[PDB]
Every structure is written in C-alpha cells, then in structure tokens.
C-alpha cells in the first residue's frame, strides 16, 4: 500500500472523507501558461505563433514589397540557470525567426513571383521559465504573478443612486474588446439612450445606428411593435392583441362586434385579457381622440400631391388623421409604447438626435473623436470603420466573442472579433430589456466576469507590442529602400522586441522578487492572483465591493488568504483544486450525482455553470459507493445554501479542502480558528525562516508532503531503483530494468544544491535522506530541502509549551523560552550574505584591487592574501576588509595642519586613495565562498587564477566521473546482453574491457541492442570532449560587465544568528509574539516527571484572539509526543518486535472510523524498526483542514500515552520547587521563527550623512538615517508644552547647519546649551516660492 520513504514514518491520519481526487501539482498554472507561450503550435495559434500570424505579413505603403513569417525556433541558452544565477545575467534563449521578403511587380496586377528572399533573423532573447516556475533575471529567481482582470465581452451595469438627485437607476452597457475602442450605451435621467466611445462626450444612441445605414423607418421597426389603425367608412378602428391591454386602465369604452368588455376608467385585469382572447377579438372601434398622442411609424406621403403628410416618428393629431384619411390612407401603422412594459426610448432619442441620414451621423461621430479637424467622406467613413469594424484595430478575441454571445443568449459560441451590425443593435436591445423589467445587470465581482490572465498570455501581449514597434520600421524602410539590395534583416530591429519583453520581465508590477525564505512562501507566491497591474484595478480605483469575499470564490479562490495591507482584497491565493478554464475563467472539481449515486467522474464547473446545478456539501455521508444515507442533504445552489431531497441533488464537493488555499490547508484544526487569526497565521507561516535542523511537525494536516515535493526544493527520484552512490554533495541512483531505458546506461545523477544564498539572504541546503545502497521507489524524495524532512514540509520546530502566566514576562503575547531551546541551537538560523567589490573607471584612472592599501593596520591585511582577497573560511567582523580596493585621487589640497601631521609621521597620503569592501557595521560571519568576474582583457589577480585552476580541475574530475559512471553502467548492460547469446562469464571479465564493443552475437534483436550501446558509448566519448571545451571556454572567457566596470569580486559570508529577546515567533493560528527573556533551565516550570517546559505562553492571548486551534494543536501534540515517549521507552527497554507491532497497530487504528488503514502484518521486521526509530521523537499526526480529529479522538489518543484527558498536568515552579495552584495546559505546539529578527530591526544614530536639498538627516538603517519626527509627533510636545524639546528636534537635530555642529561641540564641551538658528528647509521654501515669481521676504523688527 505505502512506498519506501512513507514506510520510514507514517502520519496517522484522522481523515474520514476518502480523497477521490488527489491533490494536483501546485505549480501547474505557471508551467502550463508559459508552456503555451513557447510551444510552437501548428494551427491553433497561441503565444509566439499567434503573435507573428497576427502582425505579419506586413506590407509597404506602395504595396509592392512585403515581409512574410515562416517559422521560429528557440536556441539553447548561452548560460544555463546554474551559470546565470552566478554571473548575474538573464536566463534566456536566442529567438531565431525565418522571414521572407516577397516583392510584387508594379506593371503586373500582383506579379507575386519576382524576388523571394529568405533569412533567419535574430530578434531578442526571450527569458525562459525554470522547472519550478521562475525566471532568472540578472541572476535572481523572479515570479510573474497571474492577473485577475475584467473579462472582455458585453456586461450590463447600472448606477443605482449615484447618477442624479432623483435616484433614477440609469442602466448601461459596455462592449469590452481585448484590443480596440470601448462601446458604451447609457440612459439619462429623462430616459433617452446615448452612445459614447472610449468614454468620450455623449452622442444620441441613434447616431451609431444611422452610421450603419439605418433609416428613421428601419430604426423604429427594430425596437417598437406595430399597431395597425384601420379607418372604415367613418368610425376609427384599431387592431387588438388582447395581451397588450394588460394591467392598464381602459381609456374609452372597449366594445367589440357586440359586447362592452371594459368601461371608461376601469382596470383591465388578467380576466378581461382572456375574455377578449377567448372571444378572438381582432378589430375594435375606437375614438378619433385616441390617436392624439400616438407616434406614426413609417412615412405617409400623399399619393395625390406626392409630399410628406407626416414624417416617421411624429405624434399624430385629429388634423393629421383628417389629412391622412382624405389623402388616401385608411391603414396607419403606429408605435406600440407602454409606460412600464414596452418603453418609448429610441422614439424620444430620435427627436434629440440632430443628425438626418447616414453621412450626417458619420460626420458627427468623426467630430467627437477628432474635434476641430474638418471632416471628409473619406475621413468620417474610414475612422468609423477603423473603430469597431477593422481586422487591425479591433479584436474581442475568442473569450470576448464567447462571453458576448453567451450574454446575448446566442446560439453561436465562437465567432468574429469584429463587431457586426447585429451585435451593436442586439446590445441596445438587451439594455432596453433590462430597463423594461425582464433581464438584470451582471455584477463585476462574479468570477464568471473576472478572467484569469497568467504569464504566457501577458508575455504574448508584450511580444506583440515588440512586433508592432517593428511594423513601423518595416513600412518605413520598404518604401524608401531599394527592392533589389534590401534584405529583410536590414528592415527588422531586434532592440524594440528585446526591450518590450524586457520591460515586462523587469519593470512590470506583476514581475517581482520571489519570496523564497520558505518553500511555502515560494509555492503560494507562484499561486498568487493580483487584480492590480496594467489592465486591472488600482488602490486609487479599488472600492469595497471588489475587495470582500464573493459567493463565486467558493472552490476557486481562498477567502482566508490575503495581505492585511492596502491590498487587502486585491491580492489573493488560488484554492487547492482550482484550475484555469480553457478560456480563462476559474473552475472547481465536482463529483457528479447520477440516479442519486455519487459517480467518481469529476466535472470542473466554471463560475457560470455552477449556478445552474445544486451542489451537495462534502459533509454529507455517502453509503460507501451507494448514495446519500441521509434523506435531507445540505447543498448550495444559485449562491445560497439550503436543505434538499436526494433525487434533487445534482453534484457534490470533491474534497473537504477545496474552499481553502495551500497556505490555509497546512493550518491544523483550522475549523476551530477565527478567520481573522487564520489569515494572519497562513501569512506568517510563509515568513517562517527554515532552521538549522529541519524538524517535522508533530501536528500536521498531511498536505506537508504535497507542498514540500511540488515546491521543487526537494530532489525527487525521476526513476526508481537502487542507490549506487551516496554523498553530501550528490546522489547517483541506478534504475530498475523495467523503467530504465534500453539506450543509455540508466544511471541518474542528482548534484544536490548546497549551502546557498536565498533572496532573503537565508540558507538553502539539500541533504541526502536515503542511505548508501538503498532501494528507492519512483517519485520518492531522495534529498530533503531547507525546510523539509523525509518529504514532509518543516517550517519550524515543535516544543513543550505550557499555557500559564509568569511574572508578566508573557505580558502581551511576550514569549518566555527556556535556555535549553537556545542551547540546542534548534531555532538558530543560517543567513548567507552577498557583498560585491567593484573596480570601476573614474575620470582620473582605473581602480586597483591589491593588498597594497594606504593607511592600513596589519590586523586588516592579515586575513587578506597576496592579491588582496580574504581566504575562504576566514571569520570576519564589522570593520575587517574582505576585498582590498584602491581608487585614484587628484593631488588634493592638504590643509597646512594635515600637511604638518603627514610630515610629522612621514606617511603622506599617496595619489591613489581607498574604497575597500569591508564587513558591514555590526554583521559578522565566516567567508564560505568568493567568486571573481574579470573583464576580457583586464589584468587578472593571482587569486582569480587560483579560482580558475580550481574550477578547471574540478570540472575535469566532474566530467571524468560523468563518463566513468556512464561507461561502467553501459558495459554492465552489454555484459548481460553478451551472456544472452555467448555465455563466457568469468573468462571474459579477466582481460581488458576496452575491446568489449567489438564482440557481437548472431544477428538478433539483442545484437541490435549491442550496436546502440557501442555507438552511444562513442557518442558520449566525443561529447565528453566538446562538453569539457565548453566548460574550459566559459572559465577562460572574460565576463562582459557594465560600462566603467573592470572587474568584480563577490564575497559570501555566513552568519549563524541564534534566537534572542526581540526575535519574533509564532504558531499557525495567527498567534504572534516576541521573546522577552531567555529563562535559565533551572528556573523553568517542570512536571512531576521532572522534564522542564520549553516555552511558557500567556493563556490570556487565547480567548480574546478566538484562535482555539492552537490549544487543540497543543493537546494533540502532547498525545503525539506521549506515543513517541512510550515507543522511545520500549526501544530503550528493548522489549520485542511483536510488542512494538501491537502497540503501534493499536495506535494507528485508534480513531473512531479512520480513513487510512495501516495493517502492520504487511510490514517486515526490518521495516518496523526503521519506523519506530522515527516515531520515537513523536508520532506525526495528520488533521485535515475541515475533516480533522475530534476532542474524543484526541482524548482517546491521550489515554494511549497514559496522559490525562484534560491535557493539563501539575507543573512545579523551577525557581522555588513548590507546585502551581492548578493544572496547567502543557503539550507540543509547532512554532515558527519569523524573519523579523531584532539584529536587523535595531538601529541608532547620533550624527551622520545629510540630504542634498533639504539638508535633513537621511532615512532608514540601510542609509544609516535618523528617525522621522512627523507632525503627529510634533503635536505631542506642542500639547505637553515642552517647546525646547521640540525646537531641539526642529533645528539642531535636523536642518540648522550652524546649530548641529555647534551643539555637537557644546555637548562635548559639557555645556548642554541651546544655540539654534533657522532650518535650511525653510530657506529652500523661500527660494522655491521666489522662483515661482512670488516676492516672499523677511520683514524684520
């Protein structure tokens, strides 16, 4: 059932919901998105392929010459990731693209076969994505965050009572393309429709309709119905649709062929409507006064004269009806316009519309967007076509068209990027339907209207801008350039495409520093969604509606994961089982329910699709592949939860964990924690610095192993087999025949990344977690990362915690830790630190790096070598020189006093001064590495030459080992093939191996195997040389640096900082704290057994906080250690393998109805003792997120360890010896050391540098700056009365130049005298106001 690395230490799982869908790869979105951007798709355009097809082919203004795209290719990277991180260069690939100059004949119509030139042109190096979903830019792992923006398509919206004073809800519409102008339709207070493009000025909505050739008559025959008015003899008649006289008062006596139905001033209810419809009433006689007010639909000209009696869209009257009847028209069409149902909007809009026909509308539209410029028929028609109706300037895209059509209730899903006439009108129609009553507005916060836009798509966008920048230079140089001489590459520029993509992988809000101070930080930062960025929100533009949690988020985005900064609802981590839809919306897995039986077929419902169905919750008890047991099932549909019957159930939540994120999945007992504290806990779990010793968590969830492995930091077995060679530096594994490929030897190599720097200057080391010659299964963890242990994630350490107050040393979340925790160096952290020494070129001359430095003691030059560089391993402290650098100085004017003092000693300052790299003030560690980058042609130090000697010889032995292990492994197979055919075992292995490849067999399939192994041996033999040459070349190669820079020495220190008062610690339920005192072991509390407590927390930091999960974690952690201490006791006593089998078996099957079932009869004797050995520190326990352990299960486990139900033990004061008055909650809580360490935070300054203009102190410890005394702080001393305290901080501590130097001298003289003046910042204000042209002067006493 369980694999080999799982057999070493099984987590007792308290789950009860069988995981039908296993956790997917957590870094899927980063890899799959970028994979589309680079994968050259043949037809289904995506990424680079789509970019070229879209822009090319580009043709000239003469139309004779054009450039055409063929095909592109990615070249192998100049430096691999290994060497990019070192030299400090972008990990990118040459983009080589085939482009052809096709020229047409100007004499012939299109004489296509004239010149067909061809060449493969370089344009830019696109950055490549690593295996872990990172981009190495200038030697830094960086992650591009996926964006959540408003989807393209149509979306109807309404200002409720923000528009106007009356509170007319003005409904509106927006057609949003992926590229091109916006199209807004909106009402006004007075219910007239209007149109604005790109939110320009308001234009009558009928103006775009006229521009699309719609006559007045056609416009009314799109929105309005028809009422035919027949004039018979004398009495006027009207064609009735009974349904139209609906909830209306009868204005006249409605009477038909022979029956009065409704009287004057009487409401026509549903019954009067069916009375007329059952009697099948068609024409009704009506008064002539009834048309007074009706709007005539079409034009009615006199047949007799031939002139307008009444134009379309005009209100009729008795004099017009008289003229119509007598002229020769006894059948009038009329607009049907109800006040509440079918509203007259377009009709009143047409009277506001100043335009007459098609051409008048196009002028008016041209006059808006291009104002002042006289219009022409060419300019007006061409602009309007280039807005929405061009292949070039407009594109909704596939998502835009699909969302557009599905909004308008269309049949067609895919279609054209260009807006058609139907589209514009259909949208105006649906806008009017929403105003009428049927139809509602869509909300923007719905994730069905929020589309996810990952890296690949945003890289494609910026790459397209690169090709658009080249489009200018192509059309330019095609016209001017000769046709014969011109090749395509003379017209292309590589710098615009390089620059536009480099802007994205550099300047962009979404491209940023990978938070890698913890595997959990890395993996949840890659799973991040920001609604900020280009084409998205701003904090300026962010309301509260977008910020808060939305029904749709459920299962797509975690509601308990977001920063507590200004970006509180904007940034968001992705849920566990969430995925990007084919189009881009989010989607969540759901088990289908057919015939009431829950099928294991899973459907990833989109935000839109989820609303139809009813989804049962995961809480619902299945009959173990029957159906819902309970008759009533708790389910949710249409954004709400209620109870339902079983046959009505359509779907069910796949897992218990799906509403939460990766951060939150790792919180145990999240179910008992407040959302507010749970948020901070998941956010601080990411900030947990990995410790010296990776300790497992005793109280996990089980997601630990998913996170550690998917994060990429753990070295995992690509293929299973026996480990041939184990070492701290590397692991070499031989593969099993079944998975091993028949070609190569089949020996995998894992050179483990060793004590190396992170982006937060923390440590990264990979330790081998398998022994010499151990059998390993495929997909097992061969080596543990910095914050991982036997495959499981290890962010911090677990320890004996007692909740009780202590002399106010745990006052406000203040933490009291034992000396023993500090003594064990378990919370001690490694901080690798990078400091660079650069020799530049000044005006006076180039800078030297030698041990020959003016003004230096022998204490500083002692740790430097001949070249002037510190030895590897040498301990250094603030002041000590790491790299000796000296700079030229002009012959400076020595003041007579200095000239005396230099003539007194004799040692006069030389022409070259000094600027050596020295250890930063206060920091101190051991030098673990030094790396030297000399420019091609400049003088090399002898140390640099030793490093080249070191790298070369090491490279020779490293590739020797590559060919050696590969040769030995390759003949090992040949020997097995040679036995199958001509078995001569002992006698063939005596004489040399070198002539084994000549030996063959009779011609079988196994002879063909010998041939591939012999040819591949020579392939590796010839490849060994060209590989060794590449390493040798790169090592001899001068590293090409910035302008001015001659060479750089990068020194790496290693600080080993232990915990101290001020350091920030926390658990996983948002329970913060600062160490206050390291209490001696002698003083700490201890139980009757005698074992002292590690940490003493304040119990008053629990009820207020409402984070009770920390207490359940403590109780269960106690139970877990209780089992460990029992097994530890049984291993010390050395009882029996059958006894350990019984106790461990009863432990794993202790829960009421446990999900996992570990039969120990399957485990052999040797396997059990490896397991017991790891469980003795404490049995790791898994408490899934919402499907966790109950109190009863924890109390039951406490009885297995012979510990109290209560989880509270009688402790005794270490100082005195007497007992505390009551039992105290003690147990094991997994705590975490946060990155906020006090050695970094502490700062102080008396006197230092000053700013240029303000002349105030600098800011921050990074600049060694003074503290900001803001207006808030000014009001405090104002309020007290202390005006001297204030004036001190306003003048002599700040700007006053004469004040600050004089006061320093007063205090050294002893006299604490206030001798002030006036801030230079005021003098600046005066000159800045006078430069504005404003006389400001000091009118004196």
């Amino acid at each position: 059932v369980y694999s080999y690395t799982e057999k070493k230490r099984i987590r007792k799982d308290f789950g009860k919901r069988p995981q039908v869908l296993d956790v997917p790869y957590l870094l899927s979105i980063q890899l799959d998105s970028f994979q589309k951007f680079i994968e050259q798709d043949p037809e289904g355009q995506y990424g680079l392929e789509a970019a070229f097809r879209s822009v090319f082919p580009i043709q000239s203004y003469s139309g004779n010459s054009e450039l055409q795209y063929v095909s592109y290719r990615l070249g192998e990277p100049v430096f691999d990731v290994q060497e990019c991180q070192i030299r400090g260069v972008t990990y990118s690939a040459p983009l080589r693209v085939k482009l052809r100059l096709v020229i047409y004949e100007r004499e012939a119509p299109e004489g296509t076969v004239k010149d067909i030139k061809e060449q493969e042109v370089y344009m830019g190096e696109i950055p490549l994505m690593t295996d872990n979903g990172t981009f190495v830019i200038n030697g830094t792992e960086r992650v591009i965050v996926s964006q959540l923006h408003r989807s393209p398509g149509v979306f109807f919206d309404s200002d409720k009572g923000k528009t106007h004073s009356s509170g007319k809800v003005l409904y509106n519409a927006r057609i949003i393309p992926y590229r091109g102008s916006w199209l807004d339709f909106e009402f006004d207070p007075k219910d007239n429709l209007f149109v604005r493009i790109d939110r320009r000025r308001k234009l009558p909505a009928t103006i775009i309709l006229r521009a699309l050739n719609y006559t007045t008559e056609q416009i009314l025959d799109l929105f309005f119905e028809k009422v035919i008015f027949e004039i018979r003899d004398n009495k006027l008649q009207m064609e009735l649709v009974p349904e139209r006289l609906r909830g209306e008062t009868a204005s006249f006596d409605i009477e038909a062929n022979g029956k009065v139905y409704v009287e004057k001033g009487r409401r026509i209810t549903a019954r009067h409507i069916r009375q007329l419809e059952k009697d099948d009433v068609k024409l009704i006689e009506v008064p002539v006064e009834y048309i007074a007010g009706k709007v005539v639909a079409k034009d009615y000209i006199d047949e007799s004269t031939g002139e307008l009696i009444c134009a379309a869209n005009m209100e009729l009257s008795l004099d017009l009806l008289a003229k119509l009847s007598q002229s020769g028209h006894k059948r009038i069409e009329t607009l049907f316009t109800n006040d509440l149902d079918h509203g007259p909007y377009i009709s009143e809009t047409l009277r506001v519309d100043p335009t007459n026909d098609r051409l008048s509308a196009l002028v008016e539209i041209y006059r808006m967007m291009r104002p002042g410029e006289p219009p022409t028929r060419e300019a007006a028609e061409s602009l309007f076509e280039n807005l929405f109706f061009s292949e070039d300037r407009y594109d909704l895209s596939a998502v835009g068209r699909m969302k557009f059509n599905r909004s308008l209730l269309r049949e067609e899903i895919e279609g054209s990027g260009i807006l058609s006439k139907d589209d514009i009108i259909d949208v105006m129609k649906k806008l009017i339907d929403i105003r009428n009553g049927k139809g509602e507005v869509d909300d923007i916060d719905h994730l069905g209207n929020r589309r996810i836009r990952s890296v690949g798509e945003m890289a494609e966008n910026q790459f397209r801008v690169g090709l658009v920048r080249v489009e200018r230079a192509v059309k330019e140089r095609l016209s001017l350039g000769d046709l014969d001489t011109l090749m395509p590459q003379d017209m292309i520029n590589a710098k615009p495409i390089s620059a536009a993509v480099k802007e994205f992988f550099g300047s962009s809000q979404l491209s940023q520093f990978m938070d890698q101070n913890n595997p959990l930080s890395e993996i949840t930062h890659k799973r991040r969604i920001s609604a900020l960025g280009p084409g998205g929100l701003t904090r300026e533009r962010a309301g509260f509606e977008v910020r808060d949690v939305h029904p749709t988020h459920y299962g797509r985005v975690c509601p308990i994961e977001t920063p507590e900064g200004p970006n509180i609802g904007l940034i968001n981590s992705l849920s566990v089982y969430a995925q990007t839809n084919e189009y881009g919306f989010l989607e969540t897995p759901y088990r289908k329910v057919t015939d009431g039986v829950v099928t294991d077929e899973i459907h990833y419902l989109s935000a839109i699709e989820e609303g139809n169905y009813v989804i049962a919750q995961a809480n619902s008890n299945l009959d173990e592949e029957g159906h819902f047991v309970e008759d009533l099932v708790t389910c949710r549909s249409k954004g709400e939860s209620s109870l339902f019957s079983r046959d009505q159930v359509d779907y069910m939540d796949v897992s218990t964990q799906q509403v939460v994120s990766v951060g939150a999945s790792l919180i145990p007992f999240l179910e008992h924690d407040d959302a507010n504290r749970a948020l901070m806990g998941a956010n601080m779990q990411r900030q947990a610095v990995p410790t010296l010793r990776a300790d497992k968590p005793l109280v996990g969830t089980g997601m630990e192993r998913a996170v550690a492995v998917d994060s990429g930091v753990t070295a995992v077995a690509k293929r299973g087999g026996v480990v041939q060679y184990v070492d701290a530096s590397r692991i070499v594994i031989k593969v099993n025949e079944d998975e091993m490929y028949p070609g190569e030897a089949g020996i995998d190599i894992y050179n483990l990344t060793k004590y190396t720097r992170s982006n937060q200057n923390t440590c990264i080391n990979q330790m081998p977690c398998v022994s010499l010659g151990e059998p390993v299964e495929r997909g097992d963890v061969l080596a543990d990362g910095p914050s991982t242990d036997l495959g499981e994630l290890a962010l911090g350490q677990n320890m004996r915690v007692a909740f009780m107050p202590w002399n106010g040393y745990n006052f406000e979340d203040s933490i009291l830790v034992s000396e023993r925790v500090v003594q064990e160096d378990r919370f001690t952290t490694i901080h690798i630190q990078e400091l660079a020494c650069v020799s530049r070129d000044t005006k006076l001359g180039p800078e030297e790096i030698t041990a020959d430095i003016p003004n230096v003691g022998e204490a500083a030059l002692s740790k430097l070598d001949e070249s002037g560089i510190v030895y590897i391993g040498a301990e250094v402290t603030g002041g000590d020189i790491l790299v000796g650098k000296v700079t030229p100085k002009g012959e400076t004017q020595l003041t007579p006093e200095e000239k005396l003092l230099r003539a007194i000693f004799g040692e006069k300052a030389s022409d070259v001064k000094d600027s050596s790299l020295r250890v930063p003030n206060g920091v101190s560690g051991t030098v673990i590495d030094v790396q030297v980058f000399t420019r091609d042609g400049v003088e090399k130090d002898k140390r640099a030459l030793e490093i080249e000697e070191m790298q070369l010889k090491q490279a020779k032995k490293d590739l020797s080992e590559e060919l050696q292990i590969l040769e030995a492994g390759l003949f090992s197979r040949i020997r097995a093939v040679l036995v199958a055919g001509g078995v001569e075992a002992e006698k063939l292995d005596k004489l040399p191996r070198d002539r084994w490849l000549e030996l063959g067999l009779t011609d079988e399939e196994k002879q063909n195997q010998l041939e591939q192994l012999a040819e591949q041996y020579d392939e590796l033999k010839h490849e060994f040389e060209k590989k060794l040459e590449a390493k040798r070349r790169k090592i001899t190669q001068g590293d090409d640096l910035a302008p001015g820079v001659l060479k750089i020495v990068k020194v790496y220190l290693a600080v080993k900082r232990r915990i101290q008062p001020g350091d920030k610690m926390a658990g996983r339920h948002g329970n913060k704290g600062v160490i206050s005192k390291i209490n001696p072991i002698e003083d700490m509390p201890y139980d009757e057994n005698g074992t002292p407590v590690d940490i003493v927390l304040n119990p008053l930091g629990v009820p207020s906080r409402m984070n009770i999960g920390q207490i359940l974690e403590t109780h269960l952690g106690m139970a877990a250690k209780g089992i460990g201490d029992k097994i530890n006791a049984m291993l010390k006593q050395q009882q029996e393998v059958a006894k350990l089998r019984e106790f461990i078996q009863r432990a794993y099957d202790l829960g009421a109805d446990v999900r996992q079932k570990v039969d120990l009869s399957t485990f052999s004797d040797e396997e059990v003792m490896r397991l017991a050995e790891n469980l003795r520190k404490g049995m790791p326990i898994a408490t899934p997120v919402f499907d966790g352990a109950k109190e009863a299960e924890i109390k039951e486990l406490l009885k297995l360890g012979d510990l109290p139900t209560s989880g509270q033990i009688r402790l005794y004061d270490g100082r005195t010896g007497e007992q505390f008055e009551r039992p105290v909650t003690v147990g094991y809580m997994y705590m975490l050391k946060l990155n906020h360490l006090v050695d970094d935070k502490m700062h102080a300054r008396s006197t230092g540098s000053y700013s240029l203009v303000t002349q105030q102190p600098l800011g921050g410890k990074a600049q060694f700056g003074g503290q900001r005394f803001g207006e808030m702080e000014v009001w405090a001393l104002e309020a007290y009365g202390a005006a001297y305290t204030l004036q001190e901080m306003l003048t002599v501590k700040s700007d006053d130049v004469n004040g600050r130097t004089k006061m320093y001298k007063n205090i050294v003289d002893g006299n604490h005298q206030m001798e002030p003046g006036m801030p230079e910042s005021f003098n600046v204000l005066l000159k800045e106001i006078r430069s504005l042209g404003i006389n400001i002067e000091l009118e004196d006493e």
Binding site: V1238, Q1256, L1277
Partner: protein, 251 residues
Amino acid sequence: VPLDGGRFATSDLNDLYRRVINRNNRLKRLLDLAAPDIIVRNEKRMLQEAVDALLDNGRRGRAITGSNKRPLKSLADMIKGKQGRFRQNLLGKRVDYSGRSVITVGPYLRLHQCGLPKKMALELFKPFIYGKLELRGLATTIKAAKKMVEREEAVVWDILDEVIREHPVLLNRAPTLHRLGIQAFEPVLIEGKAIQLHPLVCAAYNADFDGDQMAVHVPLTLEAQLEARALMMSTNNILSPANGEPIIVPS
C-alpha cells in the same frame, strides 16, 4: 550630482528649465529672422506651455512627461500637498540622536524606567562620552576619544553608565494619536538589543509585544532634560487628558 558608478542624476526642474530656455532662444532667433507670424505664434504658444509646465506642471493642460512616463515634478509641486516642503520637511523632520528597535516587556522595571540597549545608548550619547573622556583625562582629542569608543574599551562602558544616570530618554510609538504616545523614562542599560517597555504605560502607547517598534530620542539640552523629567516623564503623566481617569491601569 554623480551616482556612484559614472551615471549622473538630475532634478526634473533642470529638464523644465531647458525647455523654456531652448524655446526662448529660438523665439529670439525667429524674431531676428522676421519669420512669418504663423511660425512666431507657434513658438509663443510653446513658450507659454514650457513656462506654465515649469511653474505648475499638471494644471493648465496635460502635464509634460519625461523618460519614465510619469510627469516632470514642477516648482509648485515641491510646495504643494503632502510631499511638499511644508508637510514633509518643515512641519516634521528627520532627527539626530534617534533610533528604534523591537520592544519587549520589562516587568522588573519601575514606572519611571525603560530598558535601553548598550550599543544603542553608545551610538546615541556619543558627544556626551567624548565630553566626559576629556574631563577625566582619558582622551587628548576628539579623534582619540572616537577610537576609544569604537574599540568599546572597558573604561568607556563605565563613562557611558555615568552620563545616562539621571539623564532621561524619550520613547515614541506610531501612531502618535495623543501626547501620551511620547513618554520620558530614565534609561536602564541592558544586555540584549531589544527595548524593554514598562507594562503599565502599554495602554497609552497601545503597544502589544508581538513585534512593535518604538523610537528613541535623546533630550540633549539642559532645558530638554528638565522638560523630559517635569512634563513628559511617565510618572508625571498618569491621568488621560481626554478623560479625568488614570490611563496607567493594570491589565
């Protein structure tokens, strides 16, 4: 001014002054050339634009953007609003003889006391140490006294201890909502790098120890030492100025 590397850096005013001078010099030349008025007018329009952009960039029309795409900061901008001289460099200031650190409890302390780290207090009280070192006759000059303190000699800790007795320090927390957000204490030198705050004044600061940071200020002048001790001392400030009730209340 020159950036460390060979690159230089300039204010946005230099870029706006250069537009004004170019268009003014070109205008003088086009008036010398007696060019048509059409050309002269365009140049007069551009002069108005460059002068108006120098004074207040974002006011008359679209603000003139430089290389970064953001608009060039004008003269008016360095007077106006938050980041103006007034609110940022005049009604509030960066201050000498100031530091900060992570605070922690001090339940042994008295209400008139606060734990002030060794190395913080050393850098804070530098001039007073050089002043005592000349009086006790240990250092001849200030440069000599500077190196004695930098080496952290045993004699220097004893003198540092001498200056700090009966010499108060001000402690501040953000946000400074009311005057009790700054209180004065007599320093107690301690072993670690973290400030120890008295539990009873925690209420005024709203300071919980879950990693709060508090700013340190030295009252240098004798006036300021007396103002710290008489007005702003913690023991002097017990009742709230808002309500006649004690803010110093056990929790």
